[PDB]
Write a protein that binds this DNA or RNA. Structure first.
Ligand SMILES: [Zn+2]
Ligand SMILES: [Zn+2]
Length: 105
DNA sequence: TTGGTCTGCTA
DNA sequence: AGCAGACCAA
């Protein structure tokens, strides 16, 4: 579980992250989504909107503590979003070239 | 908010 | 495994 330098390969982006296998991909997925125009996470309990899985979960925790029901899992985003193909596409454009992001290597 | 870092378990 | 909840710092 050593530290790896993960680089975003999207056009004109110089973002990089210190990353370990155990971290998982939340921060990386959210960064890829910043390259998706007009993509927004809408709160299912009010008119709040934001970008990013981490942010919408923080909104749920702070603004809706009576809703014990949890937000979406990271492995549900691609397969249930109407723009899921675009989301998986922007992930590949951003991070696919980082070989260590592959499972089992 | 976001980054850097951390880790128990539906281990 | 790595999700996803956690901390503090900026
Ligand atoms: Zn980027
Ligand atoms: Zn809300």
């Amino acid at each position: 579980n050593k530290v790896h330098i993960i680089k975003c390969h999207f056009d004109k982006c110089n973002k990089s992250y210190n990353w370990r296998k155990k971290y998982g991909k939340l921060r990386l997925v959210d960064h890829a989504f910043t390259h998706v125009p007009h993509l927004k996470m809408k709160c299912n309990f009010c008119d709040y909107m934001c970008k990013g899985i981490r942010n919408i979960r923080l909104h749920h925790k702070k603004s809706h503590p009576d809703e014990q029901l949890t937000g979406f899992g990271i492995k549900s985003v691609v397969r249930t979003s109407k723009k899921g193909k675009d989301l998986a596409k922007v992930w590949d454009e951003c991070f696919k070239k980082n070989r260590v992001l592959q499972h089992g290597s």
